[PDB]
Amino acid sequence: MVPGRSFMAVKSYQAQAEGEISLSKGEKIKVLSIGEGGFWEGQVKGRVGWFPSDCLEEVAN
């Protein structure tokens, strides 16, 4: 439900939809919105949109 802790991307992503955005391995993705399944909205070095959380991972380790 709209998390705060910034998650780090473990892999890059190539936007395919109209509201989808790309990603960058090692880039700190700041989630801003969420939906269902492994998909949610976030921000990456500027690029803010929708994308699969599969390419994202906590920043604990």
Side-chain angles (χ1 to χ4, degrees):
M1 207 71 78
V2 182
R5 45 154 160 287
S6 50
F7 281 67
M8 182 212 95
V10 292
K11 54 219 292 261
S12 65
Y13 182 76
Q14 191 184 353
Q16 314 202 1
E18 91 187 24
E20 260 78 312
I21 53 144
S22 89
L23 264 87
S24 266
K25 207 271 218 84
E27 210 56 71
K28 207 69 64 146
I29 323 307
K30 173 53 160 290
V31 171
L32 300 177
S33 251
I34 63 172
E36 198 52 88
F39 237 88
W40 60 357
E41 244 252 23
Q43 167 160 13
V44 56
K45 46 82 63 109
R47 265 218 161 72
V48 188
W50 301 62
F51 67 87
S53 102
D54 201 16
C55 315
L56 259 283
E57 268 304 273
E58 263 203 33
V59 295
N61 286 257

Coordinates of all heavy atoms in Angstrom, one line a residue:
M1 N 0.8 -1.2 0.0 CA 0.0 0.0 0.0 C 0.9 1.3 0.0 O 1.1 1.9 1.0 CB -0.9 0.0 1.2 CG -2.2 0.8 1.0 SD -3.3 0.0 -0.1 CE -4.1 -1.3 0.9
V2 N 1.4 1.6 -1.2 CA 2.2 2.8 -1.3 C 3.4 2.8 -0.3 O 3.4 3.5 0.7 CB 1.4 4.1 -1.1 CG1 2.3 5.3 -1.3 CG2 0.3 4.1 -2.1
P3 N 4.4 1.9 -0.5 CA 5.5 1.8 0.3 C 6.5 3.0 0.3 O 6.4 3.8 -0.6 CB 6.3 0.5 -0.2 CG 5.8 0.5 -1.7 CD 4.4 1.0 -1.7
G4 N 7.3 3.1 1.3 CA 8.2 4.2 1.3 C 9.7 3.8 1.0 O 10.4 4.5 0.2
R5 N 10.1 2.8 1.7 CA 11.5 2.3 1.4 C 11.8 2.1 0.0 O 11.0 1.4 -0.7 CB 11.7 1.0 2.2 CG 10.6 0.0 2.0 CD 11.0 -1.5 2.2 NE 9.9 -2.4 2.5 CZ 9.3 -2.4 3.7 NH1 9.7 -1.6 4.6 NH2 8.3 -3.3 3.8
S6 N 12.9 2.7 -0.5 CA 13.3 2.6 -1.9 C 13.9 1.2 -2.2 O 14.7 0.8 -1.5 CB 14.3 3.7 -2.3 OG 15.3 3.7 -1.3
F7 N 13.4 0.6 -3.3 CA 13.9 -0.7 -3.7 C 14.9 -0.6 -4.8 O 14.8 0.3 -5.7 CB 12.7 -1.6 -4.1 CG 11.9 -2.2 -3.0 CD1 11.2 -1.4 -2.1 CD2 11.9 -3.5 -2.8 CE1 10.5 -1.9 -1.1 CE2 11.2 -4.1 -1.7 CZ 10.5 -3.3 -0.9
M8 N 15.9 -1.5 -4.8 CA 16.9 -1.5 -5.9 C 16.6 -2.5 -6.9 O 16.2 -3.6 -6.7 CB 18.3 -1.8 -5.2 CG 19.4 -1.8 -6.2 SD 20.7 -3.0 -5.8 CE 20.2 -4.4 -6.8
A9 N 16.8 -2.1 -8.2 CA 16.5 -2.9 -9.3 C 17.7 -3.9 -9.6 O 18.8 -3.5 -9.7 CB 16.3 -2.1 -10.6
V10 N 17.3 -5.2 -9.6 CA 18.3 -6.2 -9.9 C 18.5 -6.5 -11.3 O 19.5 -7.2 -11.7 CB 17.9 -7.6 -9.2 CG1 18.0 -7.4 -7.6 CG2 16.6 -8.0 -9.6
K11 N 17.7 -5.9 -12.2 CA 17.8 -6.1 -13.6 C 17.0 -5.0 -14.3 O 16.1 -4.4 -13.8 CB 17.2 -7.5 -14.0 CG 15.8 -7.7 -13.5 CD 15.5 -9.1 -13.1 CE 15.6 -10.1 -14.2 NZ 14.2 -10.5 -14.7
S12 N 17.5 -4.7 -15.6 CA 16.8 -3.6 -16.4 C 15.5 -4.1 -17.0 O 15.3 -5.3 -17.1 CB 17.8 -3.1 -17.4 OG 18.1 -4.2 -18.4
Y13 N 14.7 -3.2 -17.4 CA 13.4 -3.5 -18.1 C 13.2 -2.6 -19.2 O 13.5 -1.4 -19.2 CB 12.3 -3.5 -17.1 CG 11.0 -3.9 -17.6 CD1 10.6 -5.2 -17.9 CD2 10.0 -2.9 -17.9 CE1 9.4 -5.5 -18.4 CE2 8.8 -3.2 -18.5 CZ 8.5 -4.5 -18.7 OH 7.3 -4.9 -19.2
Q14 N 12.5 -3.1 -20.3 CA 12.2 -2.3 -21.4 C 10.7 -2.1 -21.5 O 9.9 -3.1 -21.8 CB 12.7 -3.0 -22.7 CG 12.6 -2.1 -24.0 CD 13.0 -2.8 -25.2 OE1 13.5 -4.0 -25.2 NE2 12.8 -2.2 -26.4
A15 N 10.2 -0.9 -21.3 CA 8.8 -0.5 -21.4 C 8.2 -1.1 -22.7 O 8.8 -0.9 -23.8 CB 8.6 1.0 -21.3
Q16 N 7.0 -1.7 -22.6 CA 6.3 -2.2 -23.7 C 4.9 -1.5 -23.9 O 4.4 -1.4 -25.0 CB 6.2 -3.7 -23.6 CG 7.4 -4.4 -23.2 CD 7.4 -5.9 -23.6 OE1 6.5 -6.4 -24.2 NE2 8.5 -6.6 -23.2
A17 N 4.3 -1.2 -22.8 CA 3.0 -0.6 -22.8 C 3.1 0.9 -23.0 O 4.2 1.4 -23.3 CB 2.3 -0.9 -21.5
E18 N 2.0 1.6 -22.8 CA 2.0 3.1 -23.0 C 2.3 3.8 -21.7 O 2.9 4.9 -21.7 CB 0.6 3.5 -23.4 CG -0.4 3.9 -22.3 CD -1.8 4.2 -22.8 OE1 -2.1 3.7 -23.9 OE2 -2.5 4.9 -22.1
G19 N 2.0 3.2 -20.6 CA 2.3 3.7 -19.3 C 3.4 3.0 -18.6 O 3.7 3.3 -17.4
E20 N 4.1 2.1 -19.3 CA 5.2 1.4 -18.7 C 6.5 2.1 -18.9 O 6.6 2.9 -19.9 CB 5.3 0.0 -19.3 CG 4.7 -1.1 -18.5 CD 3.2 -1.2 -18.5 OE1 2.6 -0.1 -18.4 OE2 2.6 -2.3 -18.7
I21 N 7.4 1.9 -18.0 CA 8.7 2.6 -18.1 C 9.9 1.6 -18.0 O 9.7 0.4 -17.7 CB 8.9 3.6 -16.9 CG1 8.7 2.9 -15.6 CG2 8.0 4.8 -17.1 CD1 9.6 3.4 -14.5
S22 N 11.1 2.0 -18.4 CA 12.2 1.1 -18.4 C 12.9 1.1 -17.1 O 12.5 1.8 -16.1 CB 13.2 1.6 -19.5 OG 14.1 2.6 -18.9
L23 N 13.9 0.3 -16.9 CA 14.7 0.2 -15.7 C 16.2 0.1 -15.9 O 16.6 -0.1 -17.1 CB 14.2 -1.1 -14.9 CG 13.1 -0.8 -13.8 CD1 11.7 -0.9 -14.4 CD2 13.2 -1.9 -12.7
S24 N 16.9 0.1 -14.8 CA 18.4 0.0 -14.9 C 19.0 -0.8 -13.8 O 18.8 -0.5 -12.6 CB 19.0 1.4 -15.0 OG 19.2 1.9 -16.3
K25 N 19.7 -1.9 -14.1 CA 20.3 -2.7 -13.1 C 21.2 -1.9 -12.2 O 22.1 -1.2 -12.6 CB 21.2 -3.8 -13.8 CG 21.3 -5.1 -13.0 CD 22.5 -5.0 -12.0 CE 23.2 -6.3 -11.9 NZ 24.2 -6.5 -13.0
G26 N 20.8 -2.0 -10.9 CA 21.6 -1.3 -9.9 C 21.0 0.1 -9.6 O 21.4 0.8 -8.7
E27 N 20.0 0.5 -10.3 CA 19.3 1.7 -10.2 C 18.3 1.7 -9.0 O 17.5 0.7 -8.9 CB 18.6 2.2 -11.5 CG 18.5 3.7 -11.6 CD 19.9 4.4 -11.5 OE1 20.7 4.2 -12.5 OE2 20.2 5.1 -10.5
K28 N 18.3 2.7 -8.2 CA 17.4 2.8 -7.1 C 16.0 3.2 -7.5 O 15.7 4.4 -7.8 CB 17.9 3.7 -6.0 CG 17.4 3.4 -4.6 CD 18.0 2.1 -4.1 CE 19.5 2.3 -3.9 NZ 20.1 1.5 -2.7
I29 N 15.1 2.2 -7.6 CA 13.7 2.5 -8.0 C 12.8 2.9 -6.8 O 12.7 2.1 -5.8 CB 13.1 1.3 -8.7 CG1 14.1 0.6 -9.6 CG2 11.9 1.7 -9.6 CD1 14.8 1.5 -10.5
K30 N 12.2 4.1 -6.9 CA 11.3 4.5 -5.8 C 9.9 4.3 -6.2 O 9.3 5.1 -6.9 CB 11.6 6.0 -5.6 CG 10.6 6.7 -4.6 CD 10.5 5.9 -3.3 CE 10.0 6.7 -2.2 NZ 10.9 7.8 -1.8
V31 N 9.3 3.3 -5.6 CA 7.9 2.9 -5.8 C 7.0 4.1 -5.4 O 7.2 4.6 -4.3 CB 7.5 1.6 -5.1 CG1 6.0 1.4 -5.2 CG2 8.3 0.4 -5.7
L32 N 6.0 4.4 -6.2 CA 5.1 5.5 -5.9 C 3.6 4.9 -5.9 O 2.8 5.4 -5.1 CB 5.2 6.6 -6.9 CG 6.5 7.3 -7.0 CD1 6.5 8.3 -8.0 CD2 6.9 7.9 -5.6
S33 N 3.4 3.9 -6.7 CA 2.0 3.3 -6.8 C 2.1 1.8 -6.9 O 3.2 1.3 -7.2 CB 1.3 3.9 -8.0 OG 0.2 4.8 -7.6
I34 N 1.0 1.2 -6.8 CA 0.9 -0.3 -6.8 C -0.4 -0.8 -7.4 O -1.4 0.0 -7.4 CB 1.2 -1.0 -5.5 CG1 0.1 -0.6 -4.5 CG2 2.6 -0.6 -5.0 CD1 0.2 -1.3 -3.2
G35 N -0.5 -2.0 -7.8 CA -1.7 -2.6 -8.3 C -1.9 -4.0 -7.9 O -2.1 -4.3 -6.7
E36 N -1.8 -4.9 -8.8 CA -2.0 -6.4 -8.6 C -0.8 -7.2 -9.1 O 0.0 -6.7 -9.9 CB -3.3 -6.9 -9.2 CG -3.8 -8.2 -8.6 CD -3.9 -8.1 -7.1 OE1 -5.0 -7.7 -6.6 OE2 -3.0 -8.5 -6.4
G37 N -0.8 -8.4 -8.6 CA 0.3 -9.3 -9.0 C 1.7 -8.7 -8.8 O 1.9 -7.9 -7.8
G38 N 2.7 -9.0 -9.6 CA 4.0 -8.5 -9.5 C 4.2 -7.2 -10.3 O 5.3 -7.0 -10.8
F39 N 3.2 -6.4 -10.4 CA 3.3 -5.2 -11.2 C 2.9 -4.0 -10.3 O 1.9 -4.0 -9.5 CB 2.3 -5.2 -12.4 CG 3.1 -5.0 -13.7 CD1 3.7 -6.1 -14.3 CD2 3.2 -3.8 -14.2 CE1 4.3 -5.9 -15.5 CE2 3.8 -3.6 -15.4 CZ 4.4 -4.6 -16.1
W40 N 3.6 -2.9 -10.4 CA 3.4 -1.7 -9.7 C 4.0 -0.5 -10.3 O 4.8 -0.6 -11.3 CB 3.9 -1.8 -8.2 CG 5.3 -2.1 -8.2 CD1 6.2 -2.3 -9.2 CD2 6.1 -2.2 -7.0 NE1 7.5 -2.5 -8.7 CE2 7.4 -2.5 -7.4 CE3 5.8 -2.2 -5.6 CZ2 8.5 -2.7 -6.4 CZ3 6.8 -2.4 -4.7 CH2 8.2 -2.6 -5.1
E41 N 3.7 0.7 -9.8 CA 4.3 2.0 -10.4 C 5.4 2.5 -9.5 O 5.4 2.3 -8.3 CB 3.2 3.0 -10.5 CG 2.9 3.5 -11.9 CD 3.4 4.9 -12.2 OE1 4.3 5.3 -11.5 OE2 2.9 5.5 -13.1
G42 N 6.4 3.1 -10.2 CA 7.6 3.6 -9.4 C 8.3 4.6 -10.2 O 7.9 5.0 -11.3
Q43 N 9.5 5.0 -9.7 CA 10.3 6.0 -10.4 C 11.8 5.5 -10.5 O 12.3 5.0 -9.5 CB 10.3 7.3 -9.6 CG 11.3 8.3 -10.1 CD 11.0 9.7 -9.7 OE1 10.0 10.0 -9.0 NE2 11.7 10.7 -10.3
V44 N 12.4 5.7 -11.6 CA 13.8 5.3 -11.8 C 14.6 6.4 -12.5 O 14.4 6.7 -13.6 CB 13.9 4.0 -12.7 CG1 13.2 4.2 -14.0 CG2 15.3 3.6 -12.9
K45 N 15.6 6.9 -11.7 CA 16.4 8.0 -12.3 C 15.6 9.0 -13.1 O 16.1 9.5 -14.1 CB 17.6 7.4 -13.1 CG 17.1 6.3 -14.0 CD 16.6 6.9 -15.3 CE 17.7 7.7 -16.1 NZ 18.2 7.0 -17.3
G46 N 14.3 9.2 -12.8 CA 13.5 10.1 -13.5 C 12.3 9.4 -14.1 O 11.2 9.8 -14.0
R47 N 12.6 8.3 -14.9 CA 11.5 7.5 -15.5 C 10.5 7.0 -14.5 O 10.8 6.1 -13.7 CB 12.1 6.3 -16.3 CG 12.4 6.6 -17.7 CD 12.1 5.4 -18.6 NE 11.9 5.7 -20.0 CZ 12.8 6.1 -20.8 NH1 14.1 6.2 -20.4 NH2 12.6 6.4 -22.1
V48 N 9.3 7.6 -14.5 CA 8.3 7.3 -13.5 C 7.1 6.7 -14.3 O 6.5 7.3 -15.1 CB 7.8 8.5 -12.7 CG1 6.9 8.0 -11.6 CG2 9.0 9.2 -12.1
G49 N 6.7 5.4 -14.0 CA 5.6 4.8 -14.6 C 5.3 3.4 -14.0 O 5.6 3.2 -12.9
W50 N 4.8 2.5 -14.9 CA 4.5 1.2 -14.4 C 5.6 0.2 -14.9 O 6.2 0.4 -15.9 CB 3.1 0.7 -15.0 CG 2.0 1.6 -14.6 CD1 1.9 3.0 -14.8 CD2 0.9 1.2 -13.8 NE1 0.7 3.4 -14.3 CE2 0.1 2.4 -13.6 CE3 0.4 0.1 -13.2 CZ2 -1.1 2.4 -12.9 CZ3 -0.7 0.0 -12.5 CH2 -1.5 1.2 -12.3
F51 N 5.7 -0.9 -14.1 CA 6.7 -1.9 -14.4 C 6.7 -3.1 -13.4 O 6.2 -2.9 -12.3 CB 8.1 -1.3 -14.4 CG 8.6 -0.9 -13.0 CD1 9.2 -1.8 -12.2 CD2 8.4 0.4 -12.6 CE1 9.6 -1.4 -10.9 CE2 8.8 0.8 -11.3 CZ 9.4 -0.1 -10.5
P52 N 7.1 -4.2 -13.9 CA 7.1 -5.5 -13.1 C 8.1 -5.4 -11.9 O 9.3 -5.0 -12.1 CB 7.6 -6.5 -14.0 CG 8.4 -5.8 -15.1 CD 7.7 -4.5 -15.2
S53 N 7.6 -5.7 -10.7 CA 8.5 -5.6 -9.5 C 9.5 -6.8 -9.5 O 10.4 -6.8 -8.7 CB 7.6 -5.7 -8.2 OG 7.6 -7.0 -7.7
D54 N 9.3 -7.7 -10.4 CA 10.3 -8.8 -10.6 C 11.7 -8.3 -10.7 O 12.6 -9.0 -10.3 CB 9.9 -9.7 -11.8 CG 10.4 -11.1 -11.6 OD1 10.8 -11.5 -10.5 OD2 10.4 -11.8 -12.7
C55 N 11.9 -7.2 -11.4 CA 13.2 -6.6 -11.6 C 13.6 -5.8 -10.4 O 14.7 -5.1 -10.5 CB 13.2 -5.8 -12.9 SG 12.4 -6.6 -14.3
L56 N 12.8 -5.8 -9.4 CA 13.1 -5.0 -8.2 C 13.4 -5.9 -7.0 O 13.0 -7.1 -6.9 CB 11.9 -4.1 -7.8 CG 12.1 -2.6 -8.2 CD1 13.0 -1.9 -7.3 CD2 12.6 -2.5 -9.7
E57 N 14.1 -5.4 -6.0 CA 14.5 -6.1 -4.8 C 14.8 -5.2 -3.6 O 15.3 -4.1 -3.8 CB 15.7 -7.0 -5.1 CG 15.4 -8.4 -5.5 CD 14.5 -9.1 -4.6 OE1 15.0 -9.7 -3.6 OE2 13.2 -9.1 -4.8
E58 N 14.5 -5.6 -2.4 CA 14.7 -4.8 -1.2 C 16.1 -4.3 -1.2 O 17.0 -4.8 -1.9 CB 14.4 -5.7 0.0 CG 13.0 -5.5 0.6 CD 12.9 -5.8 2.1 OE1 13.9 -5.6 2.8 OE2 11.8 -6.3 2.5
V59 N 16.4 -3.3 -0.3 CA 17.7 -2.7 -0.2 C 18.3 -3.1 1.2 O 19.0 -2.3 1.8 CB 17.6 -1.2 -0.3 CG1 17.2 -0.8 -1.7 CG2 16.7 -0.6 0.8
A60 N 18.1 -4.4 1.6 CA 18.6 -4.9 2.9 C 20.0 -5.4 2.7 O 20.9 -5.3 3.5 CB 17.7 -5.9 3.5
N61 N 20.2 -6.1 1.5 CA 21.5 -6.7 1.2 C 21.9 -6.5 -0.2 O 21.0 -6.2 -1.0 CB 21.5 -8.2 1.6 CG 21.5 -8.5 3.1 OD1 22.6 -8.9 3.6 ND2 20.4 -8.3 3.7

